[PDB]
RNA sequence: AGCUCUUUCUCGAUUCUGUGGGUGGUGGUGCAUGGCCGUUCUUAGUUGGUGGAGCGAUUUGUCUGGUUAAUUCCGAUAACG
């Protein structure tokens, strides 16, 4: 949005630059091309950082529009997102799934794990492909974190970022939790937040 | 064998006689059947419900690999129980 109260600050841009979020792959799909700045002299694509913040605020404006927070479902089958989705679901009251998704969880009405959500958020479209393709049987809207070579086939909001691993995946979930809590009125739009980004990251060498 | 022939005593409504109808049969059909037994077959095999795939007969589950006397376990996984 145009508003100064929604503008991206210097201190967020430095946190993007320090985590590698702007660095894509060596390949580009034709659906992702509008999110790209340029290709480097070494064959790597640069993701446009202002495009990310608009698509992330549009995603937060979808997540705030659900009146019961337990109706939102959150997923990661790769390890680099598992701590991050568990912390996101603690900060705001969504339902997490981590590890293997069981086929038929959304469509086998009798099943012990059966559930019926209103919104679905996924960490990587190529890896999390079962809950994406299974959402096509039940009228379920979708948000996803997309790299330059991600296949867009059932996602309705794609957020441009490096999703390969490490600090970049944890930072995106932390920043999405910050803005949903801000615009619902639970924390300040000006005072810094008490939760450090480093709480969401995956398994750097411990000692 | 009073079976039958000659003879001349005996019993007492129980039988005899014609028609209808029964009853019995190690008689016929095991290619009309039940029950029982043998064999395919001594091996590891077989099947619903709800979900997914095909216009359909059908299929997945019931598996690439390792392990076991074993569809026995581990694990993998559009299937779950």
Distance A198 CA to B74 C1' (A): 38
For residues A105 and A135, what is the distance between their CA atoms, to the nearest angstrom?
Answer: 10
CA A120 → C1' B49, Å?
30
DSSP for A28-77 reads --TTTGGGEEEE-SSS-EEEPHHHHHHHHHHHHHHHTT-SSGGGEEEEE-
Q: Give the closest nucleotide to A104 (alpha carbon vs C1').
A: B51
How far apart are alpha carbons A53 and A100 in whole angstroms? 30
CB A110 within 8 A of CB A53: no
> Solved by what technique?
cryo-EM
State the Cα angle at A152 between A144 and A134, rounded to 5°.
70
Output phi, psi for A173, to 5 deg.
-65, -40
The Å distance, CA of A183 to C1' of B80, is 40
Question: Resolution in angstroms, to 1 decimal, for this deposition?
Answer: 2.9
Which strand B bases fall within 7 angstroms of a protein CB? 49-52, 77-81
From the CA of A48 to the C1' of B76: give the distance in Å. 40
3-state secondary structure of A156: coil
- List the beta bridge partners of residue A159: A145
Residue ranges covered by each domain of chain A: 12-207
User: HSE-up of A137 (CA within 13 Å, CB side)?
Assistant: 12
Number of neighbours of residue A68 by Cβ within 10 angstroms: 8
State the sign of the Cα–Cα–Cα–Cα dihedral A83, A141, A92, A187. positive
């Amino acid at each position: 949005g145009a508003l100064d109260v929604l503008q991206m600050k210097e201190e967020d841009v430095l946190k993007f630059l320090a985590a590698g979020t702007h660095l894509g792959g060596t390949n580009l799909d034709f659906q992702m091309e509008q999110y790209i700045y340029k290709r480097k002299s070494d064959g790597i694509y640069i993701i446009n950082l202002k495009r990310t913040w608009e698509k992330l605020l549009l995603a937060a404006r979808a997540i705030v529009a659900i009146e019961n927070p337990a109706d939102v479902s959150v997923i990661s089958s790769r390890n680099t997102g598992q701590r991050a989705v568990l912390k996101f679901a603690a900060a705001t009251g969504a339902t997490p799934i981590a590890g293997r998704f069981t086929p038929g969880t959304f469509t086998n009405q009798i099943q012990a794990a059966f559930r019926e959500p209103r919104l679905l958020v996924v960490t990587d479209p190529r890896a999390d492909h079962q809950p994406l393709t299974e959402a096509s049987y039940v009228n379920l809207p979708t948000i996803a974190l997309c790299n330059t070579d991600s296949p867009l086939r059932y996602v309705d909001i794609a957020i441009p970022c490096n999703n390969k691993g490490a600090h970049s995946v944890g930072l995106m979930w932390w920043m999405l939790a910050r803005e949903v809590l801000r615009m619902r009125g639970t924390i300040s739009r000006e005072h810094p937040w008490e939760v450090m980004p480093d709480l969401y990251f995956y398994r750097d060498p411990e000692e």
